[PDB]
Design a protein around this ligand. Structure first.
Ligand code: HEM
Ligand code: HEM
Ligand SMILES: COc1ccc(Br)cc1O
Lengths: 137, 137
């Protein structure tokens, strides 16, 4: 289930994080509007760019914590508020997170592994709802 | 407290893992007996090797899983058994773990961040006791 998937991802978190975020950027190339420095770079070039490696690592370290603190894939409202109030996220909207989780679910379904993709689909929808309630446009 | 410290560490897991492991290796030079491939390299030379960060991150992920599953800083006997039975740990005794947590507590106390160093010292002691109970010499 969802809780075991958190353990699976955490057990190889750097590789999963970079692969899922790359899947996001390659499924939705226009999302580089928020990452101008990512333009004109292959996956392997991005993986050697410090700001990509560091942001991606932060994304998934904190996402696994938010998932871990969730009940039945519903995040804490306080976790959603913290995400909304992050300064570097000022230009984001719920659509950015929606797309991230569509790519993550697609990645899990395509993997060879026993991920509970339905739970991650719910988690992403419930996070988006919570971000909206917390003030994200 | 302890639970928040797990969240702090997980929030920047690779960085904290490398810095705490380096603190251990430098406090106890003989402990590189179990790390032949790290001999003859400075802290920054080690951090530059992707395998060092990869290994340290995976170690500390399991450490955080054991810490999060603990009750009042007492680890589960089943988690201690896992650590005893790991093939990678066949050469080890509890003193190896005692020294790791002495260095970890020293790192936390010098950090100037608000770690609950007392709880981590207790956790390390209770982990050592639990490793002994699970069959480590
Ligand atoms: C759970 C999801 C996310 C977490 C935990 C997270 C976390 C962080 C953190 C800690 C920083 C600093 C940061 C910066 C940033 N984030 Fe996120 N983020 C997330 C999702 C996103 C998404 C979906 C986007 C865009 C599609 C994004 C764009 C950015 C940008 C542009 C910065 C500034 C980075 C820079 O200028 O170097 N983040 N994020
Ligand atoms: C609670 C404490 C510890 C945890 C959670 C832990 C966990 C782990 C994990 C997950 C690995 C596999 C690493 C990987 O896949 O890259 C590993 C390997 C290893 N650990 Fe531990 N460990 C702990 C303490 C120690 C201590 C104190 C020592 C020695 C002083 C030690 C020595 C080793 C060695 C020699 C390996 C083999 C290195 C390799 O993977 O090639 N561990 N440990
Ligand atoms: C002493 O063994 C270890 C302790 C902490 C990390 Br991080 C990695 C290790 O290999």
């Amino acid at each position: 289930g969802f809780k075991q998937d958190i353990a699976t991802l955490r057990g190889d978190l750097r590789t999963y994080a970079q692969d899922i975020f790359l899947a996001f950027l390659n499924k939705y190339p226009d999302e580089k509007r928020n990452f101008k420095n990512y333009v004109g770079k292959s996956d392997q070039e991005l993986k050697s760019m410090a700001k990509f490696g560091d942001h991606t690592e932060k994304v998934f370290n904190l996402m696994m914590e938010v998932a871990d603190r969730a009940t039945d894939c519903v995040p804490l409202a306080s976790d959603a508020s913290t995400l909304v109030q992050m300064k570097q996220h000022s230009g984001l909207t719920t659509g950015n997170f929606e797309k991230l989780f569509v790519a993550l679910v697609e990645y899990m379904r395509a993997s060879g592994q026993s991920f509970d993709s339905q739970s991650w689909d719910r988690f992403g929808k419930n996070l988006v709802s919570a971000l909206s309630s917390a003030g994200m446009k």
